[PDB]
Amino acid sequence: MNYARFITAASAARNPSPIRTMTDILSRGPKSMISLAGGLPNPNMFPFKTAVITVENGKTIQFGEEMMKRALQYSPSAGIPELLSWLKQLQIKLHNPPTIHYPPSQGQMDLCVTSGSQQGLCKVFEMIINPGDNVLLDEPAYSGTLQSLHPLGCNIINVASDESGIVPDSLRDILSRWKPEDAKNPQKNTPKFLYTVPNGNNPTGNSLTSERKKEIYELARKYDFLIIEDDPYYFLQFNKFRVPTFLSMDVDGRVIRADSFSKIISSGLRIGFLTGPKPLIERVILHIQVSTLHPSTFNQLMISQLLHEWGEEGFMAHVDRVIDFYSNQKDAILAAADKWLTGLAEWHVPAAGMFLWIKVKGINDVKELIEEKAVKMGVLMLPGNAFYVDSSAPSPYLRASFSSASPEQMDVAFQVLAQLIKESL
Amino acid sequence: MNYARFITAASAARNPSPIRTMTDILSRGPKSMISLAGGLPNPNMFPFKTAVITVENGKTIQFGEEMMKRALQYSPSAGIPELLSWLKQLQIKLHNPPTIHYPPSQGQMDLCVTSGSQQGLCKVFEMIINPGDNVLLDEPAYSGTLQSLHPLGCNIINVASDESGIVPDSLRDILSRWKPEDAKNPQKNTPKFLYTVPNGNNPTGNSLTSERKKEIYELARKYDFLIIEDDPYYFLQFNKFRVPTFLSMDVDGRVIRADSFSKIISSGLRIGFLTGPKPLIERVILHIQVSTLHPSTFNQLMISQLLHEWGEEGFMAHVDRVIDFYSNQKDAILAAADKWLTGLAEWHVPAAGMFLWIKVKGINDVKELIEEKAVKMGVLMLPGNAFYVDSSAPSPYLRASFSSASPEQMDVAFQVLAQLIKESL
Ligand SMILES: Cc1ncc(COP(=O)(O)O)c(CN)c1O
Ligand SMILES: Cc1ncc(COP(=O)(O)O)c(CN)c1O
Ligand SMILES: Nc1ccccc1C(=O)C[C@H](N)C(=O)O
Ligand SMILES: Nc1ccccc1C(=O)C[C@H](N)C(=O)O
Known part of the structure; x- marks a missing residue:
């Protein structure tokens, strides 16, 4: 609700671009419009001309001359339009986030394609964490998460976990170190977020139950912290009934969800996606605009065409x-x-x-x-x-x-x- | 020289570890060795099977079933080995850096494939800059670099420039605020680096001359700052005798060079590379390991195969x-x-x-x-x-x-x- 407390000074300082409000005007102008405004290199100079990619259980993917030029050229920071829409519609089918029609300022669901899900998580951690900040998570934890959080100087507060993931009574008793209001109240250092892998945790293989997810969510609102749901094994649950996600119950706009195609479609293509409240997704997009600029447009096209034909x-x-x-x-x-x-x-x-x-x-x-x-x-x-x-x-x-x-x-x-x-x- | 000066406390805190000493031993072990230690997903599950990519002035690129599995799979943080070696050999041929046979702890030339050259620049900026640090560049300058540096809260000191790039008199005059010895001492804040686009500055089109480069390098040695050589138009010089790079004169090991294939080979593939002193390249590799993990291995293989055949x-x-x-x-x-x-x-x-x-x-x-x-x-x-x-x-x-x-x-x-x-x- 107060998204400003979960955004660092550096992160709040990020601006738009600006340049490309210009080359934006070109998109909706007359076909007779001449632009000398943009910074795109001429794609005719690039040496790769066409591609054909065979698929198992699927029609072959073809990039013709015009599609190849697009595959080889800069594309939007948050992802190509057809992959963002396919993905947002998928999140709606899968999790029907309560937040989809909220006003933007009130955490309307937004989504960006990232260069791997780990990219999304790193930018999220960077967006949030001032040194000395308290963060919650269950050990054993993904070594990439721990190695990412360490140079950030947060205090990691271990929450107890068992066969069924984080134990909500452990969470409760950690959080009684504060009372709520505490949270509306800076500099106490009430925890900024709880991070967890809810499905098939790396390394333990344990998954959260739905009842326990509901209890954790309740704690999250009470102490007003973010939940970061890092869910790269979401599409690898052995129970054919998938457990409801934190995002499916995010009536407050307090969940950030990382999804991965690394286990199911390709790890080497470096394409994941991050879903969550519009003002928070906006901060990660601005940081990516100054770092990777965007995910591989060729790789997005390969995935998006695959996904659309399927x-x-x-x-x-x-x-x-x-x-x-x-x-x-x-x-x-x-x-x-x-x-x-x-x-x-x-x-x-x-x-x-x-x-x-x-x-x-x-x-x-x-x-x-x-x-x-x-x-x-x-x-x-x-x-x-x-x-x-x-x-x-x-x-x-x-x-x-x-x-x-x-x-x-x-x-x-x-x-x-x-x-x-x-x-x- | 003293690389620790140019490394943040966050950057200095990053760790290599803690898992892939296991992939280490597997490579150099017998074929009969069995590993359950790695975190690679099974590439056989991935839906893309083969690729055929036509090349103009070139032989077509074919990824058969085995090469595609590799293209779809995680690969090393710094880049695939054949691309790294091709690129390092290129730098030797083009720039013959003085630093190639130095001990690692001294400035030994190193090189990292990045997800576009702007990714490498952004991590360099992040690696070095504490809020309040002084940094030097010429205005007008690339908007993306200005938008990257702003949130880091550094003080940008503009250095004068004309048709021939930064004016060394202007740089010399700016540095006389300090004595050369003040560099040895953190608290009075001598500049950390000089950033310039030496060829075809965006937005100006102007390039540094070889003689100004030498004077600018003299100044950097004198006041012991780094030069960050952001050179994406290095392969787009109209004069077909290319001016010597900062990297080519870098006898101290104080140059960090960003190259891009974005203008000549593909912008949308997000492949560039960063060349510099092993200790600082190492700090950016570690930040990549927790963010993008590595550049798309598919797109690296496309470029590497093109380059090797050419x-x-x-x-x-x-x-x-x-x-x-x-x-x-x-x-x-x-x-x-x-x-x-x-x-x-x-x-x-x-x-x-x-x-x-x-x-x-x-x-x-x-x-x-x-x-x-x-x-x-x-x-x-x-x-x-x-x-x-x-x-x-x-x-x-x-x-x-x-x-x-x-x-x-x-x-x-x-x-x-x-x-x-x-x-x-
Ligand atoms: C728990 C967890 N989170 C994130 C990731 C990284 O995923 P991606 O390849 O989508 O960047 C992994 C990969 N092992 C993981 O296990
Ligand atoms: C001066 C400059 N530096 C960096 C970049 C970003 O290049 P890359 O696509 O290699 O990330 C650009 C883009 N035109 C540029 O003009
Ligand atoms: N980052 C981009 C994203 C999309 C299209 C172009 C670019 C650029 O490289 C910036 C361009 N040189 C500009 O200064 O307008
Ligand atoms: N973090 C990495 C770095 C390099 C290559 C792979 C990974 C991973 O995907 C993590 C792996 N599954 C692991 O937990 O070991």
Whole structure:
């Protein structure tokens, strides 16, 4: 509601452009209009002339001479128009955000295409965080988030989590360090935001339940903080009934949601999207206008043409088949773990995503086991140390990926693991 | 020299880690090694399967099934290795920087592929600038750089410039406010860097001479500041003997150079590169790791394959052909200005790039002429105000692009402009 408290001095200082209100006038003028105003290079000089890209379960994508010129040329900072509209309509189909028809100043849903979702998150963190600011999140947490937040000088306040994600009673008891009003009231330092991966957390694989999401949202309004819903495994939930998102219940305009195409369509193309209140999305667009300028227009066109030919049906049909693939991988890694790990280790079943989080029994830090012993036997899993704000502290946990390994190679890795565990007790 | 001076506390706090020492060992291990440690999604799920991309004056680019999987997948933060090595070899050939065989901790030349050259510039600015820092540049200057620097709260000290770029007397005189020894001491705030666009300044078209470059470099050594060489029109110099770069004379390791393929190969692909002392390139790599992660690996592969097939000879031939094109546009717009505007405005012939900078004679501010009268007559040029730190001050200057317009379009636009100038005297 007071979006100004969640916007730094540097971020508030960002301005429009200005230049291109001019080349804007060209768009709606007569076809006889001559512009010498713009700063576009001549695309006729660019060496790539046409493209044809084959698709599985889909018609081939063709860029002809005119489309190629557009693919190779500057495009709008927030994204190409057809991809922004397709994406906004998708958010409406999926989450029907309460906020879609609110006035702009009151946090009307806006959305921008980012160069990967991580771009959206980084700009968001940069938009918000003054050193000494308090932020909430559940460890274990995505190491990219922790590495992004560290140089910002926030105090990270760990919220307790279990098989079902953040524990709302833990959140409650952290927040009683303040009362609300506190928040309407600066410089106390009531938390600016709570960040979480609600579906298939990296590294734990745990997902928030809907009931718990409702409790967290209630806390968020009470202490007036932002929720940043970083949801890159949103389209990889193994339950075919997707749990309601924070964005679907954002009646206040206090959620910022990052979505990713990195797990489902392409990670290397660097295309994600950020959804949230208009005045906050506007600040990230201005920062991108001075940094990446825009996401690859070629890559947006490839995605947008794919998405439009599929329709929301072809899109959903595709996420379904990939979930089916990851769910079989999940089953196979669970079967390997049950087989070899013994009463040797404990793990929860991943509710989404692509990682298994394994607690090794009777070993207080697993870095030697993995960095030294397992590497020598040609088997790599990831120690848990990376997923904590304090990475120097001992961790008995291992992250194991199930995205790619065959059943045979999971069987070998887990028998080797079990042996070294037993050799180390 | 002392790189820590030019690195923020946020920037200095960034960490490399904490995961991909695991990808490290996998590469240089046996083929029989099994990894579950990485966070790569399965590329087989991605819907694009092959690409065929035609090239003018070139052999067609083919991404078969295996190369496409690579193109759709995460890749290293600093760029794909074949593009980095091609680009570093280019810099050696073009600029032969003194710094190439220095120890890393001293200025060893390094290079980072960025998501456009403006991404690298923006992270350099972010890496260096504390609010209140002094920084040096010539006005008029690129609007995007002015819009990037403003929110960082630095003090921009304008350095005088003429037809031949920044005037070293003006720079020398500005620096006499300090003694050279004051650089050794943070609190009295000697400038952190000099920023300039040495070839075809946007909006002016003027280029630095080789002799002024040497004097400017002498000054930078004397008062120990960095030079940031933003050189996107480096490959668009009309004089076909290219003036020596700051990078080419950089015996101290104090130059950061931004190059762009935006004007010559593709703006919409968002691929540029940043060349500079290893310690500072390293700080920008780490900021990229938490923001974009890496430039699109698809678009890097397109460019790398084009470049490798062309070789250094094919690349420079292409740059010759595009130069010849922009040179002919320059001639056509100069001819139109001479035709219509003689006695009514003054301009220098552009030495590189794509802009003509026109000072109109009897009019103190060109905003009404351009924003109101010219618009109504259907011709757009860009008012000069946008290229100054204080955009609110009157400007009698106009920027006209010659990248695209036909000679007839230029004729009619300058005929209209001339008439409106005379109606406004
Ligand atoms: C929790 C989380 N958030 C964000 C990202 C980065 O996603 P993107 O590729 O869309 O930038 C990842 C990638 N592992 C992630 O696991
Ligand atoms: C002087 C200058 N610097 C930087 C840029 C941005 O270039 P890039 O597309 O490589 O990000 C431009 C764009 N014309 C420019 O004129
Ligand atoms: N950033 C852009 C986005 C779109 C189109 C052009 C540009 C530019 O590079 C700025 C141009 N040189 C200008 O000064 O109008
Ligand atoms: N942050 C990265 C940097 C480089 C390459 C990939 C990534 C990731 O996508 C994170 C990965 N899934 C991980 O948690 O290890």
